[PDB]
Swiss-Prot record:
It holds the Pfam family Lipocalin. Cytoplasmic retinol-binding protein. Accepts retinol from the transport protein STRA6, and thereby contributes to retinol uptake, storage and retinoid homeostasis. All-trans-retinol binds at K40, M62, Q108. One of its GO terms (cellular component) is lipid droplet. Interacts (only as retinol-free apoprotein) with STRA6. One of its GO terms (biological process) is vitamin A metabolic process. CDD domains: CRBP1. This is Retinol-binding protein 1. Keywords: Cytoplasm, Lipid droplet, Retinol-binding, Transport, Vitamin A. Forms a beta-barrel structure that accommodates hydrophobic ligands in its interior. Its main location: cytoplasm. InterPro entries: Calycin, CRBP1, Fatty_acid-bd, ILBP, Lipocln_cytosolic_FA-bd_dom. GO terms for molecular function: all-trans-retinol binding; fatty acid binding; retinal binding; retinol binding.
Length: 134
């Protein structure tokens, strides 16, 4: 396990448009979303974690307990509900989102002062990197 606490800004984004296409997100929103460089505020307190993907255009908030399955309301992305579980896999943070879509989930880890995040859905993989600014 590692410590994700902090405020992070996006450095890079790769294959995000195809990842959103796999979720049936409309073209217009896909183009707009891929041009946004959202911040990430993570509050880690024990096994309780809050991850806020921030943008004035639109936000997405996660508030969960590691190891405990919860009903994830993805309103704002594709408006789906998934039975999600986020667990530790060594120093990596694994998330599996069970629902209508195949292979939906993500993996997060740290390299120096950078947050690495890979998102997957329907066999598609998106890669993002963030820099710890606070
Ligand atoms: C579609 C869409 C967006 C998607 C956000 C996503 C897919 C966030 C995933 C966050 C995760 C996995 C956080 C855990 O570290 C954002 C809000 C950028 C802008 C508006 C359009």
């Amino acid at each position: 396990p590692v410590d994700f606490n902090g405020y992070w800004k996006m450095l890079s984004n790769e294959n995000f448009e195809e990842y959103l296409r796999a979720l049936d997100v409309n073209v217009a929103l896909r183009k707009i979303a891929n041009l946004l460089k959202p911040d990430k505020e993570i509050v880690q307190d024990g096994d309780h974690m809050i991850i806020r993907t921030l943008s004035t255009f639109r936000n997405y908030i996660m508030d969960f307990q590691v190891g405990k399955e919860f009903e994830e309301d993805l309103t704002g992305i594709d408006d789906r509900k998934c039975m999600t579980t986020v667990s530790w896999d060594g120093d990596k943070l694994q998330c599996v989102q069970k629902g209508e879509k195949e292979g939906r989930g993500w993996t997060q880890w740290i390299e120096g002062d950078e947050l690495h995040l890979e998102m997957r859905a329907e066999g598609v993989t998106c890669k993002q990197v963030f820099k710890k600014v606070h």
